[PDB]
Structures are given as structure tokens and as C-alpha cells.
Write a new protein. Structure first.
Ligand SMILES: Cc1cn([C@H]2C[C@H](OP(=O)(O)O)[C@@H](COP(=O)(O)O)O2)c(=O)[nH]c1=O
Ligand SMILES: [Ca+2]
Length: 137
């Protein structure tokens, strides 16, 4: 029952937050189930691998032919008005790619928006951990 819908990139902001045109409306999207390191907020500062995660997401969405968003089963926006979705760049989930590279942690799992939680934890993050990649080094 989850389905992918088209969207158009407006601009990548950091590793886990991107602005997209979705159904004619400009919106900020925040990637479900992950957290890339901080690059903007003063209380946190530039966290290690924050710049790298931002560069990674920007490259991925900017070089994509097709961007798709897939909402989960619960809330579609968070308290800041950001769309909560799994985002796909030519069919590759950016959320998963970041976790697989050790550039993001599985975080903020709020049910019922947890459909891909087991794959992201058990496969992608577990593998990044085993390889000691980037945040896991
Ligand atoms: C990913 C995600 C984040 N959030 C909220 C939790 C955090 O709130 P707080 O600002 O109160 O800590 C914040 C983390 O996002 P950032 O990583 O963009 O800061 O966004 C949700 O409410 N739902 C989600 O699914
Ligand atoms: Ca973040």
C-alpha cells in the first residue's frame, strides 16, 4: 500500500532535508527514519560527517533523472511542516543509501511510519557498522 509519487527537486539543504516541488506545491521534505549529522543548528554545531552527508545527498538528487517520494502509513508532515517521506533518486532510496554509507543513523522511528525500519536497521545500517564506515569509524 505505500506507493511512489513524482516530485521535482528545487534544492538540497543538507544530508536529510531537501526542498521539492510536490503536486505543484514547494515543500521541505525530511527523510523518514534517518538522521544525517547537523550542519546548521548552533546547539549541535557542524557535526562530523555533516558536510559529507550533505554533499552525498546533493549529488544523488541533483544527478537524478527522476525523483520520487513515498509517504509512509501515518503522518505525512512533522511539527515543522516538513513532508516525511522515503525519497528515491532513480529508484534508489536516498534514506537507505545514506545509512548504507554510514552517513546517517536510523533515528526518529515513530510508529506507524516505520515500514522500512527493519531493512534500514538490519541490512543497511548493520552493514555500514560492520564495515566501520564514516560515522561508524
Ligand atoms: C525524521 C523525523 C523528525 N522529526 C522531528 C524530530 C526532531 O524534533 P526536534 O527539533 O524537536 O528535536 C526533528 C529532527 O530533525 P532534524 O534532524 O532535521 O533536526 O524533527 C519528527 O517529528 N518526525 C520524523 O519522522
Ligand atoms: Ca539531521
Amino acid at each position: 500500500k505505500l506507493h511512489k509519487e513524482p516530485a521535482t527537486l528545487i534544492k538540497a539543504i543538507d544530508g536529510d532535508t531537501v526542498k521539492l516541488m510536490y503536486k505543484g506545491q514547494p515543500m521541505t521534505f525530511r527523510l523518514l527514519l534517518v538522521d544525517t549529522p547537523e550542519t546548521k543548528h548552533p546547539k549541535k554545531g557542524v557535526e562530523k560527517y555533516g558536510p559529507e552527508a550533505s554533499a552525498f545527498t546533493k549529488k544523488m538528487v541533483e544527478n537524478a533523472k527522476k525523483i520520487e517520494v513515498e509517504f509512509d502509513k501515518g503522518q505525512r508532515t512533522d511539527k515543522y511542516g516538513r513532508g516525511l517521506a522515503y525519497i528515491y533518486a532513480d529508484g534508489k532510496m536516498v534514506n537507505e543509501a545514506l545509512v548504507r554509507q554510514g552517513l546517517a543513523k536510523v533515528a526518529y522511528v515513530y510508529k506507524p511510519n516505520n515500514t522500512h525500519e527493519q531493512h534500514l536497521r538490519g541490512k543497511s545500517e548493520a552493514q555500514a557498522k560492520k564495515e566501520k564506515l564514516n560515522i561508524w569509524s
